[model samples]
Target: KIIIYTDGGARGNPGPAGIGVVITDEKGNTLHESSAYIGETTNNVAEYEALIRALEDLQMFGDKLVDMEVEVRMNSELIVRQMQGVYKVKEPTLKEKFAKIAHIKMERVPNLVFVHIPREKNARADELVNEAIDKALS
Candidate 1:
């Protein structure tokens, strides 16, 4: 199984912001670490950006993606439960963005799973995310 952990942040919301991802195997061996400054964006938008990009990375395997089991762990419970359909994305603000990201997911096939984790458990990805924003702020 493939496991991915992700985080996103802004030095200030609507300020310098970025998303970061760390992908690993079931055994916890590091596979990929990436961070990008995606211009000024809100924290939730940045979270979606990170999740979308990480899913895109998995699509490189093509149709075979369906045969693989993958799980996503996130510090943002809002992002996790909402995407998992466990929590309702009721607000108009998030609903629009979620719909857009969902359309993008159709291009790839995988057993997408999302779980909410505490920030301490998500430290590395959070560290990398902040680092990216910090660099951009400078």
Candidate 2:
């Protein structure tokens, strides 16, 4: 089994944005982590981008992931619910990201699970999000 935490943020709603992802084993041993500046985008877009980037990174695990359970934890309730099909994605840009995520799910991690976590529970990923933005601006 694997656990993944992801976060994204923008200086302004559609300003400088960045994403953060952390992947770990079931026991919480860090396997991989990454952060990236995604240029200008909304917080929602950044959120979806974070998950997409994390899923794509999981591809490196290859066949090892086929039988493993992957739990994706995020601080964004909207994104989590949307991915879970509990909420509709009405925004045009988010709808595009939603489709990309679906494709990644179909092609890579089929055993993926989405879970909503409070901001405090996602501190590390959130920190990385800020770090990315800080680095980009500096």
Candidate 3:
């Protein structure tokens, strides 16, 4: 199983932000982790970037598409449920973006899921996201 812990953080809502992703194996060993500086963007945008990057990174692991069990965990329940339709995406721009994400997510599967996790459980990715923000300011 390929489990991903993903998070995005910004110093300010639209201020400097980054996306963090930590991919672990079924045994819970860290396989890979990354933080991408997304320049200036909203927390929502950074959140999308984190998810998109996690999917794209699968290519780096030699076509994990064939038979991979994937679970994507994030701290944004608002984003999570919106993506899952647990909440409304009244914003047109966000609705559009979420549509795109939904399309891509359907591209592969043994199963692909997005769920909300507490910040404490997502420390590693959260730390990387903040570090990128802090590093940018420094």
Candidate 4:
């Protein structure tokens, strides 16, 4: 089993944005970390993009993920609920990104589960989000 934490942020709602992902084993030992500046996009778009990137990165686990329980934790309630089908995505931009995430969830991580965590619970990933944006700005 593996646990993944993902977070995304934008300096402005539609301004410079980035995403962060932290993958760990069931015991909470760090396994992988990734972040990327996704140019300019909204908070929701960045949130979806972070999950998309994390799902894509999990492909590296290959057949090992076949029986592994992959839990994806995120700080965004909206994105979590959307992925869970508890909420619908109404924004056009988010709709496109939502479809991409759904495809990746089906294709790459069949056993993936989405869980919502509070912002403080996602400090590392949040830090990475800022790091990506700061690096890009520099």
Candidate No. with top lDDT = 2
Give the better candidate number (2 or 3) by TM-score. Answer: 2
- Quote the positional error of residue 91 for candidate 4 in Å: 1.1
lDDT of 3 by residue, 1-138 (tens): 889888887667987889999999888899998888889888887887888788777667875446666888899888888867789988776777777777766775436777899888999998889888888888
34 Cα displacement, candidate 1 (Å): 1.1
Which candidate has the top score in TM-score?
2
Better of 1 and 2 by TM-score: 2
Model 1 worst lDDT run, 10 consecutive residues: 58-67
For each candidate, what TM-score against the reference?
0.87, 0.96, 0.88, 0.95
Who is ahead in TM-score, 3 or 4? 4
Cα displacement (Å) at residue 55, model 4:
0.5
Candidate 2 lDDT, tens digit per residue, 1-138?
A: 889999999888989999999999988898999899999999999999999999888977875538678899999999999999999999998999999989877877788899999989988888899999998899
Per-candidate RMSD vs. true structure? 1.9, 1.1, 1.8, 1.2
- Model 2 misses residue 50 by how many Å? 0.3
Error of 3 at 2 (Å): 1.3
Which run of 10 residues does model 3 get worst, by summed lDDT?
59-68
Instruction: Report the candidate with higher lDDT, 3 versus 4.
Output: 4
